[PDB]
């Protein structure tokens, strides 16, 4: 269902693992829960088109309250992207690279 | 950079108006759409909003069921299928442009059309 | 949902006064505030978002203020081009509106 029309925050800075897919994980400062956590790359802040792919499966906040935990894993494309999760004028944003 | 919305007037109760609104001076595409109505002398309260997807839209629930929004991205225009009305629906329309992909401050107006459900 | 609540209702001050408005939500809504001017008729314009940034081309003397649960607008020095109600917005989680405060403006 509905997408988290509030602010995310990461908790610790995304990290690289196995052969480049990277892991964040993330604070929902909102109460409109549960709802499905807006997380994607992208390379175009304006379009906003997703770019590399979400490996995590269907992310929903679960929690009805203030404050809960997240976590989430992509695969970004080769080169330099945008981690961005949330909507709107509260999205968090955090640049990655991946080489090889 | 400019909303214009247009359709609002006179409804019979139960019945159904569609309202529009057409975009002009921005990638419409990109931005979150919103209605927000403002009842005679009352407040401003938000009725629907929509980016992209399903997943994307919202409905206050004063409207759920009876309201219906639409965007036409290669037009640049958003729709407003209002139906069952009823009398307290009663409002001028603002169309609404988000600063940015949805629940932000609202930095665009259109310059609002009054729907009058009357009988 | 969160609820939004503005004092005074209704004002009258005289042109160069400054008046301060408050408004306080229902729970934490960190700095995701803003402030609009509606004349009668025509639509809101914003003022200020994010509790304390002007929009551009809002005069100096409109300034924003607050944090988490209470918030303040100031008009720094009343004009007679400042007659409207004046609404703020919540945008922590969905949208909710103030009832306003009008302002009248003594002569």
């Known amino acids: 269902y509905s997408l988290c029309t509030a602010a995310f925050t990461f908790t610790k800075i995304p990290a690289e693992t196995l052969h480049g897919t990277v892991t964040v994980e993330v604070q929902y400062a909102g109460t409109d829960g549960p709802c499905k956590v807006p997380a994607q790359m992208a390379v175009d802040m304006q379009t906003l088109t997703p770019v590399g792919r979400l490996i995590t499966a269907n992310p929903v906040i679960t929690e009805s309250t203030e404050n809960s935990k997240m976590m989430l894993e992509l695969d970004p494309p080769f080169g330099d992207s945008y981690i961005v999760i949330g909507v709107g004028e509260k999205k968090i944003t955090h640049h990655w690279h991946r080489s090889g | 950079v400019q909303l214009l919305e247009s359709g609002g007037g006179l409804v019979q109760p139960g019945g159904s108006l569609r309202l529009s609104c057409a975009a002009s001076?921005?990638?419409?595409?990109?931005?979150?759409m919103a209605w927000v109505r403002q009842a005679p002398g009352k407040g401003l309260e938000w009725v629907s909003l929509l980016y992209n997807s399903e997943e994307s839209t919202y409905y206050a629930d004063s409207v759920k069921g009876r309201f219906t929004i639409s965007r036409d991205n290669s037009k640049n225009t958003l729709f407003l299928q209002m139906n069952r009305l009823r009398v307290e629906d009663t409002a001028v329309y603002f169309c609404?442009?988000?600063?940015?992909?949805?629940?932000?401050?609202?930095?665009?107006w259109g310059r609002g059309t009054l729907v009058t459900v009357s009988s | 949902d969160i609820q939004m609540t503005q004092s005074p209702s209704t004002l009258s001050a005289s042109v160069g006064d400054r008046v301060t408005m408050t408004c306080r939500a229902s729970?934490?809504?960190?700095?995701?505030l803003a402030w609009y001017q509606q004349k009668p008729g025509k639509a809101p314009k914003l003022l200020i978002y994010?509790?304390?940034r002007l929009e551009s081309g809002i005069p100096s003397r409109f300034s924003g203020s607050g944090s988490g649960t209470e918030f303040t607008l100031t008009i720094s020095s009343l004009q007679p081009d400042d007659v409207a109600t004046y609404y703020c917005?919540?945008?922590?989680?969905?949208?909710?509106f103030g009832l306003g405060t009008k302002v009248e403006i003594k002569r």
């Open positions: 729970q934490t809504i960190s700095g995701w």
């Open positions: 609404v442009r988000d600063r940015s992909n949805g629940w932000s401050s609202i930095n665009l």
């Open positions: 994010q509790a304390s």
């Open positions: 917005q919540q945008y922590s989680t969905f949208w909710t």
């Open positions: 001076g921005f990638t419409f595409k990109n931005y979150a």
